Amino acid sequence: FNPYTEFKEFSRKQIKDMEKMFKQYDDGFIDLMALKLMMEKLGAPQTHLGLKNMIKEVDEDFDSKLSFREFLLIFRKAAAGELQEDSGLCVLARLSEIDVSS
Ligand SMILES: [Ca+2]
């Protein structure tokens, strides 16, 4: 898993910023309770099911937790125009330090 060749739409700086965010809200996985805390600190808490739905959207290996690759997939979906307006994932991407739409 080389995120640098898989996610060519993000600069190395963007990917490293995404990694800094990932490591912070962290074994290398962000589970539901970790995602809950992250949305709380960001100022936008989500419901239990809202968090589960955020994970489900990018959980490509179906273990109900987010690897770094799947975290990057959130930003890929955001930058591809695939997230629903004001969805939990849209809100995470917006409130992160990371601008992907320009
Ligand atoms: Ca997963």
Side-chain angles (χ1 to χ4, degrees):
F1 167 59
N2 183 350
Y4 301 97
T5 57
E6 174 51 41
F7 290 95
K8 297 196 175 53
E9 73 265 47
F10 302 136
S11 62
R12 292 189 60 94
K13 280 140 177 172
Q14 282 179 314
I15 293 172
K16 286 290 193 168
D17 288 350
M18 298 171 193
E19 192 189 23
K20 285 143 167 64
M21 183 174 189
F22 189 84
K23 285 169 112 55
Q24 198 183 14
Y25 308 94
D26 217 338
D27 67 328
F29 295 86
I30 294 194
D31 63 15
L32 189 134
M33 279 294 114
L35 186 64
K36 183 180 110 77
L37 177 82
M38 172 199 273
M39 301 305 291
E40 280 172 346
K41 293 209 179 261
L42 289 174
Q46 305 292 313
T47 61
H48 182 220
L49 283 170
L51 293 163
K52 178 114 181 75
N53 291 333
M54 293 170 67
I55 294 173
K56 264 158 61 167
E57 193 73 13
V58 291
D59 180 22
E60 290 195 332
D61 61 9
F62 305 86
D63 62 357
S64 294
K65 62 180 180 295
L66 296 177
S67 63
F68 181 51
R69 181 191 169 271
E70 296 166 343
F71 193 67
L72 293 177
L73 212 61
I74 299 175
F75 291 88
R76 157 165 289 175
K77 284 182 146 67
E82 305 183 348
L83 298 185
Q84 177 189 303
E85 145 189 75
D86 298 326
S87 56
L89 289 185
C90 170
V91 173
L92 185 165
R94 274 188 76 203
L95 291 188
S96 81
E97 277 304 284
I98 294 135
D99 190 12
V100 303
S101 288
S102 64

